[PDB]
Design a protein around this ligand. Structure first.
Ligand SMILES: [Zn+2]
Ligand SMILES: [Zn+2]
Length: 75
DNA sequence: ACCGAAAGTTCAC
DNA sequence: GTGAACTTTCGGT
């Protein structure tokens, strides 16, 4: 939806469940094949590339979604 | 060879 | 100025 163009999907999770970041032809967990639980060791960046930033909150604080040149309220 | 995930980037409000 | 959204490339299976 906000992340990927898929209305049913929300952008969180993945087809394989080995990640979280997805907004294109990556892995929309619609049907899936059942794989989540506690499956650790998954390299995904859900948030912005900024190490100091965590992705929460914006520079103006009027929004929350930021993962590029939008609004990191920190380093 | 095919499928999935991620980077960097770009358009609209 | 800020937020929000797309295409393409690389890596893994
Ligand atoms: Zn999706
Ligand atoms: Zn950040």
């Amino acid at each position: 939806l906000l992340t990927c163009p898929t209305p049913g999907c929300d952008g969180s999770g993945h087809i394989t469940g080995n990640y979280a970041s997805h907004r294109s032809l990556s892995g929309c967990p619609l049907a899936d094949k059942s794989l989540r639980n506690l499956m650790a060791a998954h390299s995904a960046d859900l948030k912005c590339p900024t190490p100091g930033c965590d992705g929460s909150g914006h520079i103006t604080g009027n929004y929350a979604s930021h993962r590029s040149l939008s609004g990191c309220p920190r380093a």
